[PDB]
């Protein structure tokens, strides 16, 4: 199971880890991808997860989009986890670098409540432009299921833990 995590609350745990490496090690039931509405996994966590699947995640995602159309900002879809997890929950947090409503971050985290346990990144953090301290606060105030947060950057991980209220 998950190891080396710091417990933040009853159900939220955090670790300084590469989510790709964490997924390959644990093979969780659900890994969360920091997806965009088109499921175009170009960079950040999405590019890293997709590259770990040898692009199988992108091939599956393009078929999903061709059939269903784009996701909503704040929405999600469950696809295969490929070599990383049983499933991948592609969650679309608002991209503040695209001027998207930061208020949609709570709706994005609500998707996690449909899964008993998840390995996840902080939504809308990194290349999505939101404040990761704000993302962690929305996560602990929204997610009720067991979420194991992987934070890639050690310096950000320390800032998140040291400032956690
Ligand atoms: C492609 C770079 C990458 C990897 C990786 O390739 N791990 C094996 N994991 C992560 C989380 C990244 C990021 C944040 O972009």
From Swiss-Prot:
Responsible for the cleavages located at the N-terminus of the replicase polyprotein. Participates together with nsp4 in the assembly of virally-induced cytoplasmic double-membrane vesicles necessary for viral replication. Antagonizes innate immune induction of type I interferon by blocking the phosphorylation, dimerization and subsequent nuclear translocation of host IRF3. Also prevents host NF-kappa-B signaling. In addition, PL-PRO possesses a deubiquitinating/deISGylating activity and processes both 'Lys-48'- and 'Lys-63'-linked polyubiquitin chains from cellular substrates. It comes from the Viruses. This is Papain-like protease nsp3. It is a multi-pass membrane protein. May form homohexamers. Interacts with N protein. It is found in: Host endoplasmic reticulum membrane. Residues 1-165 form the Macro domain. The chain holds residues 1027 to 1191 of 7096 of the full protein. Coiled coil: none annotated. Inhibited in vitro by GRL-0617. Changing residue 162 to L: In strain: Gamma/P.1. It catalyses: Thiol-dependent hydrolysis of ester, thioester, amide, peptide and isopeptide bonds formed by the C-terminal Gly of ubiquitin (a 76-residue protein attached to proteins as an intracellular targeting signal).
């Amino acid at each position: 199971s998950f190891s080396g995590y710091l417990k933040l609350t009853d159900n939220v745990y955090i670790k300084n880890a590469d989510i790709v490496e964490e997924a390959k090690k644990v093979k969780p039931t659900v890994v969360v991808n920091a997806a965009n509405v088109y499921l175009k996994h170009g960079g950040g966590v999405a590019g890293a997860l997709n590259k770990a699947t040898n692009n199988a995640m992108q091939v599956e995602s393009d078929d999903y989009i061709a059939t269903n159309g784009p996701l909503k900002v704040g929405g999600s879809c469950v696809l295969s986890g490929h070599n990383l997890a049983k499933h991948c929950l592609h969650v679309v947090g608002p991209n503040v670098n695209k001027g998207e409503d930061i208020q949609l971050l709570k709706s994005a985290y609500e998707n996690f409540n449909q899964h008993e346990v998840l390995l996840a990144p902080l939504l809308s953090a990194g290349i999505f432009g939101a404040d990761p301290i704000h993302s962690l606060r929305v996560c602990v105030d929204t997610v009720r299921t067991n979420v194991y947060l992987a934070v890639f950057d050690k310096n950000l991980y320390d800032k998140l833990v040291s400032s956690f209220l």
